[PDB]
Amino acid sequence: TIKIGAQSMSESEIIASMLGQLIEHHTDLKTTTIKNLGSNAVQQQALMNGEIDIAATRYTGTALTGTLRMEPEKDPDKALALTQREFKKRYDLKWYDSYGFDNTYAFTVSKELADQYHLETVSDVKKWAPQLKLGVDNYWMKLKGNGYQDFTKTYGMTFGGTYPMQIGLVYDAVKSGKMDIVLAYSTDGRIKSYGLKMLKDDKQFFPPYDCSPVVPEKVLKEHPELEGIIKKMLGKIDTATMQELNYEVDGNLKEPSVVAKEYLEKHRYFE
């Protein structure tokens, strides 16, 4: 049984299920999803100690800072190449090419607020920060490198209130007016239909967050059919599509496994 890890995000559950279903489509391997992994670090340790055989969704900027403790790299291609090289060298892990989407932190407001105050960039809210309530996920306040501490230092603003909550809640928090601004994830499917506006990170504080599966080389050697199966997903899932899939779960109330199955059927399992 191939154990596929998912972080506590709809996106990760969808992709983990899709990869599992694709493996079962092509082979006699059983698969199962190890859900609710809390973070990049949890995924990393689980890969290294055999608790998961595949990490469905890891993100380059997160791993480059968090796991590798390297200086950030602004260019997506260079960041991916560095991550791939160092993951193989340091951990004998294969960090695959991206599925085709990046999922970045994005400061997000209602279009109404953006229109009223001409907000386009993160710097545009600097003068307003003391009068804004910011909603954020339950990790970002303690997060190192690109978390709240470095953000305040780089952008030189502090919000009037900061409210950590489970990430899935921030979208209706800002839509309903409870928060004025939230640190959303750019692939969330609610951003569009909730009429939200992502502000440009004009200081380039956030690194690239291209998403890939990661697998130990030992697992690939023992299951030589996995490489060609994983490859079928790479470069095929763009950000707009990921947003649509996430929406099916969070807005259309479908199970991630059903969303994955329906996508595979629509796209004929990528062949």
Ligand X SMILES: C[N+](C)(C)CCO
Is residue 151 close enough to count as binding ligand X by CB under 6 A?
no
- Under the criterion CB under 6 A, does residue 62 sit at the interface with ligand X? yes
According to CB under 6 A, which one of 21, 40, 65, 98 is a site residue for ligand X?
40
Sign of CA dihedral 182, 208, 94, 264: positive
Nearer to ligand X, 184 or 226 (CB): 184
95 sits near ligand X (criterion: CB under 6 A): no
Is position 60 an interface residue for ligand X (rule: CB under 6 A)?
Answer: no
Query: Is 107 exposed, middle or buried, given 0-12, 13-18 or 19+ CB atoms closer than 10 A?
Result: buried
**Burial status of residue 1 (CB atoms within 10 A of its CB: 0-12, 13-18, 19 or more):** exposed
Residue closer to ligand X (CB basis): 27 or 162: 162
Residue of 59, 87, 96, 159 interacting with ligand X (CB under 6 A)? 59
CA 161 to chain centre: 25
User: Measured from the CB atom, is 17 or 103 closer to ligand X?
Assistant: 103
Nearer Cβ to ligand X, position 185 or 229? 185
Q: In angstroms, what is the minimal distance from the CB of 183 to ligand X? A: 9
Q: In this complex, which beta carbon is closest to ligand X, that of residue 15 or of residue 93?
A: 15
Alpha helices, H only, the chain: 10-26, 40-48, 60-66, 76-91, 111-117, 148-155, 170-175, 190-193, 217-222, 226-231, 239-250, 256-266
> Dihedral, CA atoms, 254, 35, 80, 99, nearest 10 degrees?
-30
Binding test (CB under 6 A) with ligand X, winner from 87, 155, 194, 209: 209
Question: Shortest CA distance to 249 belongs to which of 267, 269, 263?
Answer: 263
Q: What is the largest CA-CA distance in the chain?
A: 59
Residues numbered 164-193 forming contacts with ligand X, rule: CB under 6 A: 185
Nearer to ligand X by C-beta: 211 or 215?
Answer: 211
Q: Does 103 bind ligand X (CB under 6 A)?
A: yes
Per the CB < 8 A criterion, the answer to whether 133 and 125 are in contact is no
- Residues binding ligand X (CB under 6 A): 40, 59, 62, 103, 105, 185, 209
